[PDB]
Amino acid sequence: TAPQVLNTSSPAQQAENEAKASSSILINEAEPTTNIQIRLADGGRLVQKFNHSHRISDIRLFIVDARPAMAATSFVLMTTFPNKELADENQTLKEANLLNAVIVQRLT
Amino acid sequence: NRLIVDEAINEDNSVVSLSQPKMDELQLFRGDTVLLKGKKRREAVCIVLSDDTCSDEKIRMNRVVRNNLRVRLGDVISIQPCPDVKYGKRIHVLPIDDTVEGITGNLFEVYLKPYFLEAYRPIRKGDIFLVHGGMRAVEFKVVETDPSPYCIVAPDTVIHCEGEPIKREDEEESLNEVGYDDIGGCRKQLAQIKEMVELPLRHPALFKAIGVKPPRGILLYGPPGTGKTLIARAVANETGAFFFLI
Ligand SMILES: Nc1ncnc2c1ncn2[C@@H]1O[C@H](COP(=O)(O)OP(=O)(O)O)[C@@H](O)[C@H]1O
């Protein structure tokens, strides 16, 4: 449907960008750590590196810092099978049931 | 991945329950492409991470993969991440149990399209699931194999309509489920059989510790009339070897 982004980045800098995006999110050891799983629909690659309590805007910041391909491309994440979308980007993970939930990069 | 299973909640494979503290303990990937294994060498892929109705350490699977890959409720369910598969193009138009109970029509728009919520069927091309609109008891065997491995399909392209009914005999004709419990108490010699087939049981590693395999060839001795077909088929679908009886 919509235009996507191919593998335009270097293979040797993807792990460095993933480490930079992992270090961008603050890590606290006083909370039960929730492993938020994100899979993008631009080829099937998927990573996970997160803390316990954050926001959906922090997930968008993690996606922007992970790769420079979809940083400027408009994208709306979603959860599969409530038939719902992921609005209210300032909401936390526990209130909107984002505890390790399905995140699918959908391009509009 | 060896853990106890939850009881049934719904009757759809397009909704699957979830145990989130156990996924916090384990490592499972996203959603639609997650492998589950088990009996009869049957690898299966469907959705997880969708409903979250039950509690931790027990997860509901669909009934068509409750009877398949296990024996009953209370068994050990296993999970496996199988991501990054490709996209298929309109798997089966052909159901195999209840085509004549009703009307054919377009043969895939009638029953698949009211009964999905963007779950584009990542099931084995030849595997079963009950799907119909009203009566909700129509299985299928997939004949359209546009992707080779376990893959989801693209949303709503066009295919042919060559679906014809067959009697539902294929699963117990070719993949008849038998286990250790399905032979009526031969454990004086069933243990000996299990000892003899354990080195064929997916194990090349102990062949250097055994020298030559003591099963060069095994003879079954029994009275005329006891039957040996299911006894010889017991190692089929428990080892996963190619049976090919003649
Ligand atoms: N020891 C046994 N345990 C369970 N079923 C048996 C046993 N012996 C015979 N049968 C039954 O006899 C029937 C016909 O036997 P046959 O097909 O000749 O070989 P097999 O006995 O290996 O199945 C089968 O339906 C099978 O269930």
Side-chain angles (χ1 to χ4, degrees), chain A residues 39-48 50-51 53:
Chain A
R39 173 179 161 91
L40 314 175
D42 70 323
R45 293 293 104 198
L46 73 164
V47 295
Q48 58 89 30
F50 264 102
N51 215 38
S53 188

Side-chain angles (χ1 to χ4, degrees), chain B residues 184-205:
Chain B
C186 299
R187 83 288 188 276
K188 313 205 211 152
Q189 60 265 8
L190 177 67
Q192 294 282 335
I193 284 298
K194 285 168 53 188
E195 285 177 352
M196 285 148 190
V197 306
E198 197 269 333
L199 271 298
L201 184 43
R202 67 186 184 272
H203 276 195

Side-chain angles (χ1 to χ4, degrees), chain A residues 11-12 14-15 17-19 66-68:
Chain A
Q14 284 175 354
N17 265 328
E18 183 46 60
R67 277 147 276 266

Side-chain angles (χ1 to χ4, degrees), chain B residues 181-186 189 225-234:
Chain B
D181 66 323
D182 295 300
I183 309 299
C186 299
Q189 60 265 8
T226 196
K228 295 181 177 67
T229 69
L230 283 173
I231 298 175
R233 219 171 282 104

